[PDB]
Scaffold this active site. Structure first.
Site, PDB file in Angstrom:
ATOM      1  N   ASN A 162      -3.619   5.122   8.584  1.00 50.76           N
ATOM      2  CA  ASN A 162      -2.776   5.403   7.424  1.00 50.76           C
ATOM      3  C   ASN A 162      -1.257   5.567   7.641  1.00 50.76           C
ATOM      4  O   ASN A 162      -0.789   6.304   8.530  1.00 50.76           O
ATOM      5  CB  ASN A 162      -3.362   6.605   6.687  1.00 50.76           C
ATOM      6  CG  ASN A 162      -2.781   6.789   5.300  1.00 50.76           C
ATOM      7  OD1 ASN A 162      -1.760   7.451   5.131  1.00 50.76           O
ATOM      8  ND2 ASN A 162      -3.452   6.238   4.298  1.00 50.76           N
ATOM      9  N   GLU A 204     -14.818   0.936   9.033  1.00 48.67           N
ATOM     10  CA  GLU A 204     -13.452   0.911   8.534  1.00 48.67           C
ATOM     11  C   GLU A 204     -12.955  -0.476   8.132  1.00 48.67           C
ATOM     12  O   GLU A 204     -12.421  -0.656   7.040  1.00 48.67           O
ATOM     13  CB  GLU A 204     -12.476   1.509   9.554  1.00 48.67           C
ATOM     14  CG  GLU A 204     -12.591   3.018   9.770  1.00 48.67           C
ATOM     15  CD  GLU A 204     -12.192   3.858   8.560  1.00 48.67           C
ATOM     16  OE1 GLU A 204     -11.599   3.315   7.593  1.00 48.67           O
ATOM     17  OE2 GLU A 204     -12.468   5.078   8.585  1.00 48.67           O
ATOM     18  N   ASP A 243      -2.067   7.765  -3.634  1.00 49.38           N
ATOM     19  CA  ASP A 243      -0.922   8.416  -2.994  1.00 49.38           C
ATOM     20  C   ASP A 243       0.152   7.484  -2.431  1.00 49.38           C
ATOM     21  O   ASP A 243       1.038   7.929  -1.713  1.00 49.38           O
ATOM     22  CB  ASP A 243      -1.395   9.390  -1.916  1.00 49.38           C
ATOM     23  CG  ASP A 243      -1.777   8.705  -0.616  1.00 49.38           C
ATOM     24  OD1 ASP A 243      -2.354   7.602  -0.637  1.00 49.38           O
ATOM     25  OD2 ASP A 243      -1.494   9.291   0.442  1.00 49.38           O
ATOM     26  N   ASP A 276      -3.674   1.686   4.516  1.00 50.57           N
ATOM     27  CA  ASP A 276      -4.462   1.751   5.742  1.00 50.57           C
ATOM     28  C   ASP A 276      -4.343   0.388   6.417  1.00 50.57           C
ATOM     29  O   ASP A 276      -4.562  -0.656   5.786  1.00 50.57           O
ATOM     30  CB  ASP A 276      -5.909   2.041   5.398  1.00 50.57           C
ATOM     31  CG  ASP A 276      -6.072   3.369   4.693  1.00 50.57           C
ATOM     32  OD1 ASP A 276      -5.409   4.335   5.126  1.00 50.57           O
ATOM     33  OD2 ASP A 276      -6.845   3.448   3.717  1.00 50.57           O
TER      34      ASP A 276
END
Length: 130
Positions: free
Chosen positions: A60, A35, A49, A53
């Site tokens: 998120n 990540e 959208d 993050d």
């Protein structure tokens, strides 16, 4: 802050992540590695959208933390997204615990599915003394 592998492994165990909701420490390590590369200040804007993050677990803003600019979002962890950019990962860990309390569990992060699920994740914790 960019954690060293075993440094992070020991920190996570002390924060009670080993086996949390059935998730082994090595899985949490694999998740953080893919990540953010163990980087607490990592941020990633999703143009698609309008969400972002945040942090070591790349949590998120649409569902977990509040940053004010994400449309029709929630803040389940009841935290400012700023809290997920600290060097001290206590808040990020508390929020990650909240995320997996949902039915999807660790599957909530698609990166886990791609890079960790059904793989030999022992390598992430080997030699760390945990």
């Amino acid at each position: 802050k960019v954690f060293e592998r075993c440094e992070l492994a020991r920190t996570l165990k002390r924060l009670g992540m080993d086996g949390y909701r059935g998730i082994s420490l090595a899985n949490w390590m694999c998740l953080a590695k893919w990540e953010s590369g163990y980087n607490t200040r990592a941020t990633n804007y999703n143009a698609g959208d309008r969400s972002t993050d945040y942090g070591i677990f790349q949590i998120n803003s649409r569902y977990w933390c509040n940053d004010g600019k994400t449309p029709g979002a929630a803040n389940a962890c009841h935290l400012s997204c700023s809290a997920l950019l600290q060097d001290n990962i206590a808040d990020a860990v508390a929020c990650a615990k909240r995320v997996v309390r949902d039915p999807q569990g660790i599957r909530a992060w698609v990166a886990w599915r791609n890079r960790c699920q059904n793989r030999d994740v022992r390598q992430y914790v080997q030699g760390c003394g945990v």
